[PDB]
Predict the structure of Monellin chain B/Monellin chain A chimeric protein.
Amino acid sequence: GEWEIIDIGPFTQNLAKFAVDEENKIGQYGRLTFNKAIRPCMKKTIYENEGFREIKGYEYQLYVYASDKLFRADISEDYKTRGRKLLRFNGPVPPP
Ligand code: NA
């Protein structure tokens, strides 16, 4: 796997909103209201360990404000299926 920083544009906001929608499902923090994703945001790309460079999927580490509290979410995304899942949702944490 390899990590990069990526911008906080619409695609990232969607991921962050997706983290908040999943967490609301979970209910651990009660009812959260998505605010925005903020920098810094990281993306991991995972390959197959081969040499044909076959992408398996992706992982993201995001900072996200919901209900004016800052959280750190980890999301995974499958390359072929385009399905996503919320791995971890933590905080509140201090600003980076
Ligand atoms: Na805010």
Residues 1-96 form a domain with the Nuclear Transport Factor 2; Chain: A, fold (CATH 3.10.450.10). The two ends are 24 Å apart (CA to CA).
